Design an enzyme around this catalytic site. Structure first.
Site, short mmCIF file in Angstrom:
data_model
loop_
_atom_site.label_atom_id
_atom_site.label_comp_id
_atom_site.label_asym_id
_atom_site.label_seq_id
_atom_site.Cartn_x
_atom_site.Cartn_y
_atom_site.Cartn_z
CB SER A 99 -0.97 -0.03 1.17
OG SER A 99 -1.90 1.01 1.02
CG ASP A 239 -3.12 4.09 -1.04
OD1 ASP A 239 -3.92 3.95 -1.99
OD2 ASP A 239 -3.16 3.42 0.03
CG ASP A 241 -2.92 -0.50 -1.93
OD1 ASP A 241 -3.10 0.68 -1.60
OD2 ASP A 241 -3.09 -1.43 -1.12
CG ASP A 243 -6.31 1.29 0.28
OD1 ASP A 243 -5.23 1.78 -0.17
OD2 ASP A 243 -6.52 1.06 1.49
#
Lengths: 445, 444
Positions: A99, A239, A241, A243
């Site tokens: 992340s 960010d 990834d 989410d």
């Protein structure tokens, strides 16, 4: 050591999170999740991290070894994996990523077939497998071996699906993006261009080494510089990834997850779309967000800190919108996990449907002055019972009516106790903190 | 231990675990990587379902030493060897178990020079494979290996092997059986591109169907095809295209001995067969040897295995070797047995001599021989045994003069190999099945 932390197994790739371990997570993981299905099927995607490939090879091998079918997704956001695993009728989906953390890190997160996180009991069963000395599970052979294939269509199926949650398109807007050089580096610019917006992009040039590096939702200031210079209407920082979402108004100010959630609920209630007219947040979001949220007849549902909490609360309540100060926001009508790009769509749609600029929408709540210090304890359970701390709180609690909140509490993540105050004045709330902090420090530091 | 005589073989996921394969990837990678900067390994496979699992683990292993990896996809083993010489990588890996049934897979390595690793290199991977914990380096962050695809590698390989021929193949009709294996797309392009009429079978790998009822150890369905579609020649390759076995226009099988001769005689005719010798194992039949002598070609014979043939060729500077099985080596072109390459060379003679295969093969005569392979569970125990050992004795002192026997463990497969040659197919077959029924009965 347990292996599954608060959101999967994280750790430094090839030093804690080794290929060896990654394989085992694939095999035990697959076996647990595959168990009670004829024709078992698992999908796997990842962010742009260098170590992505090393871990994807192990995880595929481990999965295949149980007999499961694998579908490779390529680089896709974590919400994408969530969406796809429910939509494809996979038994599980895996996302390789850490992340917003720096490149060296990676992680492995599972979604089961309903697009949610694994049950505790399943995670547990995996961990016990990781605990045994010898692997004594099934070794399907010959033609009973797992098959793999590519499902690169997945990302755009996903794209088409979120895209159509929008009213009309984004024409007339200039939208700047910062994709952290991560999973959304190619998807998000596509999606917004498809939606007829003008774009300026940064952090959309991943090379494996550069994810989250001075870019992304936790370093939105460079985006805010871009927004001002390119003269844009909104900045969007995803960010690693995809989410979390952090925004930047047209004047260059950071618009955080509280402000975003606030704008969404206001507009959702007005349009009759906000289920039972309530919004779910951790207890960690700003007081002004609470008071704003009530000023518009919107009831607040506050949870412990974690997003497992926000999420479990949404599920049980039949709610519809929730999230955290950090840009992790859940639009449960559509995706079963937070989605930066999805929440960014809903954001830009409101600017569009109301014809108002971000600074304006955001400025319809006013955040309270805050201050948060984490202090390094030495075992929380004692300090949680420590009479002098407990009363230093009581004293400031007595000072404000109000007209103020104090919040002190640790976790299990980093071991430390988190003192946080909010009051209409910065001075006051710095002062309650410096106080509560002196006591903690001298008593447990 | 792990290293057979030709990679490491086993049934995928039971003995050749992806765990084992990961190690072979990391440890091998390391051993082969140590003495270079910016290190680079390529990797290819046949069409077996277990190929993907094993690739996944191998690539993990290699990437973890910092090596760069290039993924070739499905490609024949000689192709892996050609490219690892050509693309200047330090190693090439191939994931395959040749003509074996599906359950089985294997891992073979090639060095910078496109030859199989030194016994010294092989010993050291082995020596790491035994070590307690691994204290090999674990590069992190930006020192980790990148992976990429090199899926045009096949075409580069085909380009090369193409020009090793005198003239196109036009006016010839060629049947192919690709064993549903690594040559499936390679072979049909290759010959088609040399302007030949093409019929195919065994070119639809689904992942489960390699060598199954097709390919060089099962050439009959092909034999029928050739006759059915009136072909000039049939060419059955094996799962990973290291072998060739052919069918003449009348539908007769033309084995490895027959190919080595057709090539041997022609090479000699054109003064391009080194030292006028052919290397073979001691497994080839009398008629083979005897037709090499007529023709003033020196036969040179090794113990059984590819390793031994290559060594011999390497040492004596010879340029044509091989086995009855169709594993044939044309060293001038390629650093390992190459099925498709042999094919081109063979089809080449036919075209140059204006002769049909039956008359090329017919120049040499096969004498009676049978080799039957018993499917067994302990090679060790098996051969040093009470109900088998003795029979052998009795038969031997009977042929005298005047026939021969060779009974032995394999080295890479779970079978014993029983072979006889004698003055008639009848006695030959009787000699063998006598032993066989016994092995069959004694050792599972």
């Amino acid at each position: 050591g347990k292996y599954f932390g608060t959101d999967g197994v994280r750790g430094v790739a090839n030093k804690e999170l080794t290929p060896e371990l990654a394989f085992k997570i694939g095999r035990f993981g697959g076996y647990v999740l595959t168990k009670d299905t004829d024709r078992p099927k698992v999908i796997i995607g990842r962010d742009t991290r260098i170590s992505g490939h090393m871990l994807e090879g192990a995880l595929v091998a481990g999965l295949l070894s149980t007999g499961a079918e694998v579908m490779r997704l390529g680089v896709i956001s974590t919400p994408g994996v969530a969406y796809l695993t429910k939509a494809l009728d996979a038994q599980a989906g895996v996302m390789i990523s850490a992340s917003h953390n720096p490149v060296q890190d990676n992680g492995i997160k599972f979604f089961g077939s309903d697009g949610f996180k694994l049950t505790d009991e399943q995670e547990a069963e995996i961990e016990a497998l990781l605990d045994k000395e010898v692997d004594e599970l099934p070794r399907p052979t010959g033609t009973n071996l797992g098959q793999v294939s590519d499902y690169f269509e997945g990302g755009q199926k996903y794209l088409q699906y979120i895209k159509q949650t929008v009213e009309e398109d984004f024409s007339g807007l200039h939208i700047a993006l910062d994709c952290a050089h991560g999973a959304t580096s190619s998807l998000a610019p596509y999606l917004f261009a498809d939606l007829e917006a003008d774009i300026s992009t940064m952090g959309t040039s991943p090379n494996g080494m550069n994810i989250n590096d001075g870019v992304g939702s936790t370093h939105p200031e460079v985006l805010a510089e871009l927004v001002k210079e390119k003269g844009a209407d909104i900045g969007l920082a995803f960010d690693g990834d995809g989410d979390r979402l952090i925004a930047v108004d047209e004047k260059g100010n950071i618009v955080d997850g509280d402000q975003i959630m606030f704008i969404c609920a206001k507009y959702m209630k007005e349009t009759g779309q906000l289920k039972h007219n309530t919004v779910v947040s951790t207890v960690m979001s700003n007081l002004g967000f609470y008071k704003a949220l009530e000023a518009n007849g919107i009831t607040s549902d506050k949870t412990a800190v974690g997003d497992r909490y926000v999420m479990e609360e949404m599920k049980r309540g039949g709610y519809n919108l929730g999230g955290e100060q950090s840009g992790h926001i859940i639009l449960l009508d559509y995706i079963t996990t937070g989605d930066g790009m999805l929440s960014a769509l809903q954001l830009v749609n409101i600017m569009k449907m109301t014809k108002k600029p971000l600074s304006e929408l955001a400025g319809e709540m006013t955040k309270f002055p805050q201050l948060l210090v984490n202090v390094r304890v030495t075992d929380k359970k004692l300090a949680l019972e420590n009479e002098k701390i407990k009363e230093i709180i009581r004293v400031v609690e007595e000072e404000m009516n109000g007209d103020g909140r104090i919040l002190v509490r640790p976790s299990g993540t980093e071991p430390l106790i988190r003192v946080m105050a909010e009051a209409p004045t910065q001075e006051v709330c710095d002062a309650y903190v410096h106080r509560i902090v002196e006591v903690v420090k001298a008593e447990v530091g």
